[PDB]
A = this chain, B = another copy of it.
């Protein structure tokens, strides 16, 4: 039963590194990523310039599910796909669940619980890929909610 692995964590939590190393050590897995698609369709404009519009986001979402479906419908060599996004939004996670249940695939979770102080340190050294402190703060809160930790 092919797997759909969702990485869960704020930017800077180690998701991309894990995904890259996992695929290298586990033949048969492929990566699917929202940031890659957003940058691609805009021909690699400066990250800060990307405007999260309903039109673009819908296109990016469409690319993710169609790619997942095309790959998962592969041969026996295909073991699964990795959705290397933050996946902090409950609605997005539910989408992948209903998607997998519809085609007989198994959804797994790869959690990257990293301390706030550490996330800030890493985020402060990513330049163009860095995220504004307020946005990071908000994603960290969503992560705590996912973990079932208390939040204000």
Contact = CB atoms under 8 A, between A and B. Distances in A.
Q: How many copies does the complex hold?
A: 2
B70 A43 contact: no
Given A19-B43, A37-B40, A70 B62 contact: yes
A41 B59 CA distance: 17
Q: Please classify the interface of chain A as helix (H, G, I), strand (E, B), loop, or mixed, using the class held by over half of its residues.
A: helix
Interface in A36-90: 36-37, 39-45, 55, 59, 62-63, 66-67, 70-71, 74, 77, 82, 84
A66 B67 CA distance: 8
B44 A40 contact: no
Contacts of A82: 43
Interface stretch (A23-31, A101-109, A112-120, A134-142): A23-31
